[PDB]
Paper text:
In this work, we diversified a de novo TIM barrel by extending multiple βα‐loops using constrained hallucination. For the diversification experiment, we used the de novo TIM barrel sTIM11‐SB as the base scaffold. This variant contains a stabilizing salt bridge cluster in the lower part of the β‐barrel (Kordes et al., 2022). Here, we introduced two or three helical insertions into minimal loops in the de novo designed TIM barrel sTIM11‐SB.
Within the crystal structure of HalluTIM2‐2, the α‐helical extension at position 1 is resolved entirely; it forms multiple crystal contacts with itself. The second extension at position 3 is not involved in any crystal contacts, and one helical turn before and after the loop could not be resolved. Notably, for both crystal structures, a significant number of crystal contacts are formed within the resolved α‐helices that had been optimized with proteinMPNN. In the case of HalluTIM2‐2, the theoretical scatter curves of both the crystal structure and the predicted structure are in overall agreement with the experimental data, with a χ 2 of 2.6 and 2.4, respectively. However, around 0.18 Å−1 both theoretical scatter curves diverge from the experimental data, suggesting a potential high flexibility in the extensions, which is especially conceivable for the partially resolved one. In contrast, in HalluTIM2‐2 and HalluTIM3‐1, a major pocket is formed through the introduced fragments above the C‐terminal end of the inner β‐sheet. These pockets show differences in size with pocket volumes of 1006 Å3 in HalluTIM3‐1 and 2000 Å3 in HalluTIM2‐2.
Residue numbers in the entry: 1 to 176, 188 to 242
The structure:
Protein backbone atom coordinates (compact mmCIF):
# COMPACT_ATOMS: atom_id res chain seq x y z
CA UNK A 1 0.00 0.00 0.00
CA UNK A 2 1.08 3.58 0.70
CA UNK A 3 4.02 3.05 3.06
CA UNK A 4 5.28 0.17 0.90
CA UNK A 5 5.28 2.32 -2.25
CA UNK A 6 6.78 5.36 -0.51
CA UNK A 7 9.73 3.13 0.44
CA UNK A 8 10.43 2.74 -3.29
CA UNK A 9 10.72 6.49 -3.87
CA UNK A 10 12.98 6.81 -0.84
CA UNK A 11 15.28 4.09 -2.20
CA UNK A 12 15.61 5.58 -5.69
CA UNK A 13 16.41 8.96 -4.13
CA UNK A 14 18.81 7.17 -1.78
CA UNK A 15 20.59 5.65 -4.79
CA UNK A 16 20.88 8.93 -6.68
CA UNK A 17 17.94 8.78 -9.09
CA UNK A 18 17.03 12.32 -10.12
CA UNK A 19 13.80 11.65 -12.10
CA UNK A 20 11.29 9.62 -10.07
CA UNK A 21 7.59 9.34 -10.89
CA UNK A 22 4.69 8.25 -8.72
CA UNK A 23 1.15 7.27 -9.72
CA UNK A 24 -1.90 7.53 -7.46
CA UNK A 25 -5.42 8.94 -7.28
CA UNK A 26 -5.16 10.58 -3.83
CA UNK A 27 -3.45 13.97 -3.83
CA UNK A 28 -2.37 13.44 -0.22
CA UNK A 29 -0.71 10.16 -1.20
CA UNK A 30 0.97 11.88 -4.16
CA UNK A 31 2.16 14.82 -2.04
CA UNK A 32 3.88 12.49 0.43
CA UNK A 33 5.80 10.74 -2.36
CA UNK A 34 6.62 14.20 -3.71
CA UNK A 35 8.35 14.93 -0.41
CA UNK A 36 10.10 11.54 -0.59
CA UNK A 37 11.79 12.60 -3.84
CA UNK A 38 9.41 11.89 -6.72
CA UNK A 39 9.34 14.82 -9.18
CA UNK A 40 6.57 13.61 -11.51
CA UNK A 41 3.19 13.07 -9.84
CA UNK A 42 0.81 11.03 -12.02
CA UNK A 43 -2.92 11.47 -11.36
CA UNK A 44 -5.12 8.67 -12.70
CA UNK A 45 -8.92 8.41 -12.74
CA UNK A 46 -11.39 5.58 -13.29
CA UNK A 47 -13.28 7.86 -15.72
CA UNK A 48 -12.02 6.09 -18.85
CA UNK A 49 -13.17 2.78 -17.36
CA UNK A 50 -16.67 4.09 -16.65
CA UNK A 51 -16.88 5.58 -20.15
CA UNK A 52 -15.70 2.28 -21.64
CA UNK A 53 -18.26 0.31 -19.64
CA UNK A 54 -21.07 2.77 -20.36
CA UNK A 55 -20.24 2.38 -24.06
CA UNK A 56 -20.33 -1.42 -23.77
CA UNK A 57 -23.65 -1.27 -21.92
CA UNK A 58 -25.23 0.83 -24.69
CA UNK A 59 -24.62 -2.01 -27.19
CA UNK A 60 -26.60 -4.52 -25.11
CA UNK A 61 -30.26 -5.39 -25.60
CA UNK A 62 -33.17 -4.08 -23.56
CA UNK A 63 -33.57 -0.87 -21.62
CA UNK A 64 -30.09 0.67 -21.33
CA UNK A 65 -30.92 4.27 -20.34
CA UNK A 66 -30.86 3.99 -16.50
CA UNK A 67 -27.61 1.98 -16.54
CA UNK A 68 -25.77 4.16 -19.06
CA UNK A 69 -26.62 7.33 -17.13
CA UNK A 70 -25.40 5.68 -13.93
CA UNK A 71 -22.06 4.76 -15.51
CA UNK A 72 -21.56 8.15 -17.19
CA UNK A 73 -22.50 9.91 -13.95
CA UNK A 74 -19.73 8.03 -12.14
CA UNK A 75 -17.28 8.89 -14.92
CA UNK A 76 -18.05 12.59 -14.48
CA UNK A 77 -17.55 12.36 -10.72
CA UNK A 78 -14.31 10.41 -11.23
CA UNK A 79 -12.80 12.95 -13.64
CA UNK A 80 -14.04 15.98 -11.70
CA UNK A 81 -12.26 14.43 -8.72
CA UNK A 82 -9.00 13.90 -10.63
CA UNK A 83 -9.04 17.53 -11.78
CA UNK A 84 -9.31 18.50 -8.11
CA UNK A 85 -6.19 16.47 -7.30
CA UNK A 86 -4.29 18.29 -10.05
CA UNK A 87 -5.30 21.66 -8.60
CA UNK A 88 -4.51 20.61 -5.03
CA UNK A 89 -1.04 19.35 -5.92
CA UNK A 90 -0.48 22.59 -7.84
CA UNK A 91 -1.76 24.35 -4.71
CA UNK A 92 0.91 22.54 -2.66
CA UNK A 93 3.88 23.33 -4.90
CA UNK A 94 4.15 20.29 -7.16
CA UNK A 95 5.78 21.40 -10.41
CA UNK A 96 5.38 18.36 -12.72
CA UNK A 97 1.82 17.00 -12.59
CA UNK A 98 0.90 14.22 -15.02
CA UNK A 99 -2.52 13.03 -16.14
CA UNK A 100 -3.35 9.90 -18.15
CA UNK A 101 -6.48 9.52 -20.27
CA UNK A 102 -7.75 8.05 -23.53
CA UNK A 103 -9.73 11.23 -24.31
CA UNK A 104 -7.55 14.13 -25.46
CA UNK A 105 -10.16 16.70 -24.43
CA UNK A 106 -9.95 15.41 -20.86
CA UNK A 107 -6.18 15.79 -21.27
CA UNK A 108 -6.66 19.36 -22.51
CA UNK A 109 -8.78 20.24 -19.48
CA UNK A 110 -6.25 18.65 -17.11
CA UNK A 111 -3.58 20.72 -18.85
CA UNK A 112 -5.53 23.87 -18.02
CA UNK A 113 -6.10 22.61 -14.46
CA UNK A 114 -2.34 22.42 -13.83
CA UNK A 115 -0.93 19.25 -15.41
CA UNK A 116 2.32 19.60 -17.35
CA UNK A 117 2.66 16.04 -18.73
CA UNK A 118 -0.21 14.65 -20.81
CA UNK A 119 -0.26 10.85 -21.01
CA UNK A 120 -2.23 9.49 -23.97
CA UNK A 121 -3.18 5.87 -23.25
CA UNK A 122 -5.41 4.88 -26.16
CA UNK A 123 -5.29 1.16 -26.94
CA UNK A 124 -5.73 1.74 -30.68
CA UNK A 125 -2.41 2.91 -32.09
CA UNK A 126 -3.89 5.10 -34.83
CA UNK A 127 -6.41 6.54 -32.35
CA UNK A 128 -3.61 7.47 -29.95
CA UNK A 129 -1.45 9.02 -32.68
CA UNK A 130 -4.38 11.24 -33.66
CA UNK A 131 -4.81 12.29 -30.03
CA UNK A 132 -1.13 13.29 -29.91
CA UNK A 133 -1.44 15.39 -33.06
CA UNK A 134 -4.59 16.99 -31.68
CA UNK A 135 -2.88 17.84 -28.39
CA UNK A 136 0.14 19.24 -30.25
CA UNK A 137 -2.06 21.65 -32.20
CA UNK A 138 -3.60 22.90 -28.94
CA UNK A 139 -0.12 23.96 -27.79
CA UNK A 140 0.70 21.03 -25.50
CA UNK A 141 4.47 20.73 -25.01
CA UNK A 142 5.03 17.55 -22.95
CA UNK A 143 3.08 14.62 -24.43
CA UNK A 144 3.68 11.13 -23.06
CA UNK A 145 2.72 7.82 -24.69
CA UNK A 146 2.53 4.34 -23.17
CA UNK A 147 3.23 1.05 -24.94
CA UNK A 148 5.07 -2.25 -24.61
CA UNK A 149 6.62 -2.08 -28.10
CA UNK A 150 9.56 0.23 -28.73
CA UNK A 151 8.56 0.72 -32.37
CA UNK A 152 5.22 2.15 -31.24
CA UNK A 153 7.09 4.54 -28.96
CA UNK A 154 9.47 5.58 -31.73
CA UNK A 155 6.54 6.30 -34.04
CA UNK A 156 4.83 8.22 -31.24
CA UNK A 157 8.15 10.00 -30.71
CA UNK A 158 8.05 11.22 -34.32
CA UNK A 159 4.44 12.39 -33.89
CA UNK A 160 5.25 14.77 -31.01
CA UNK A 161 5.45 12.63 -27.88
CA UNK A 162 8.48 13.59 -25.77
CA UNK A 163 8.17 10.99 -22.96
CA UNK A 164 8.12 7.32 -24.03
CA UNK A 165 6.71 5.07 -21.30
CA UNK A 166 7.75 1.42 -21.54
CA UNK A 167 4.94 -0.46 -19.75
CA UNK A 168 4.88 -4.27 -19.79
CA UNK A 169 2.89 -4.78 -16.57
CA UNK A 170 -0.31 -5.07 -18.64
CA UNK A 171 0.51 -8.25 -20.56
CA UNK A 172 1.75 -10.17 -17.53
CA UNK A 173 -1.45 -9.31 -15.65
CA UNK A 174 -3.46 -10.65 -18.61
CA UNK A 175 -1.54 -13.91 -19.01
CA UNK A 176 -2.10 -14.62 -15.31
CA UNK A 177 7.29 -19.70 -8.70
CA UNK A 178 5.47 -20.05 -12.04
CA UNK A 179 3.54 -16.82 -11.45
CA UNK A 180 6.87 -15.22 -10.54
CA UNK A 181 8.56 -16.89 -13.52
CA UNK A 182 6.17 -15.23 -15.99
CA UNK A 183 6.67 -11.89 -14.23
CA UNK A 184 10.42 -12.17 -14.82
CA UNK A 185 9.92 -12.96 -18.52
CA UNK A 186 7.98 -9.71 -18.88
CA UNK A 187 10.62 -7.67 -17.03
CA UNK A 188 13.27 -9.05 -19.40
CA UNK A 189 11.08 -7.90 -22.30
CA UNK A 190 10.48 -4.43 -20.85
CA UNK A 191 14.21 -3.93 -20.25
CA UNK A 192 14.87 -4.74 -23.92
CA UNK A 193 12.38 -2.10 -25.08
CA UNK A 194 14.33 0.50 -23.10
CA UNK A 195 17.63 -0.71 -24.59
CA UNK A 196 16.52 -0.37 -28.21
CA UNK A 197 14.87 3.01 -27.60
CA UNK A 198 18.19 4.25 -26.23
CA UNK A 199 19.89 2.79 -29.32
CA UNK A 200 17.37 4.48 -31.62
CA UNK A 201 18.01 7.75 -29.77
CA UNK A 202 14.90 8.23 -27.61
CA UNK A 203 15.57 11.24 -25.40
CA UNK A 204 13.17 10.74 -22.45
CA UNK A 205 12.44 7.06 -21.73
CA UNK A 206 10.22 6.09 -18.80
CA UNK A 207 9.54 2.70 -17.23
CA UNK A 208 6.62 1.47 -15.12
CA UNK A 209 7.04 -0.93 -12.19
CA UNK A 210 6.49 -1.18 -8.44
CA UNK A 211 9.88 -2.56 -7.35
CA UNK A 212 12.83 -0.20 -6.94
CA UNK A 213 15.29 -2.86 -8.14
CA UNK A 214 13.31 -3.22 -11.37
CA UNK A 215 13.41 0.54 -11.90
CA UNK A 216 17.12 0.51 -11.01
CA UNK A 217 17.79 -2.14 -13.65
CA UNK A 218 15.66 -0.35 -16.25
CA UNK A 219 17.63 2.74 -15.22
CA UNK A 220 20.79 0.79 -16.07
CA UNK A 221 19.39 -0.18 -19.48
CA UNK A 222 18.64 3.46 -20.27
CA UNK A 223 15.36 4.54 -18.67
CA UNK A 224 15.34 8.23 -17.74
CA UNK A 225 12.12 8.29 -15.68
CA UNK A 226 11.54 5.59 -13.05
CA UNK A 227 7.78 5.44 -12.52
CA UNK A 228 6.59 4.00 -9.21
CA UNK A 229 3.03 2.69 -9.59
CA UNK A 230 1.16 1.49 -6.51
CA UNK A 231 -1.89 0.26 -8.46
Amino acid sequence: DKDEAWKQVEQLRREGATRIAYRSDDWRDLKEAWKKGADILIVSSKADDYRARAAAAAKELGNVKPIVDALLAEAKKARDEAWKQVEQLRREGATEIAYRSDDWRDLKEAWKKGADILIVDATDKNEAWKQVEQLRREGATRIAYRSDDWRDLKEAWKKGADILIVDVNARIEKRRAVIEAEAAKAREEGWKQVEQLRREGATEIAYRSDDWRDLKEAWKKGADILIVDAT
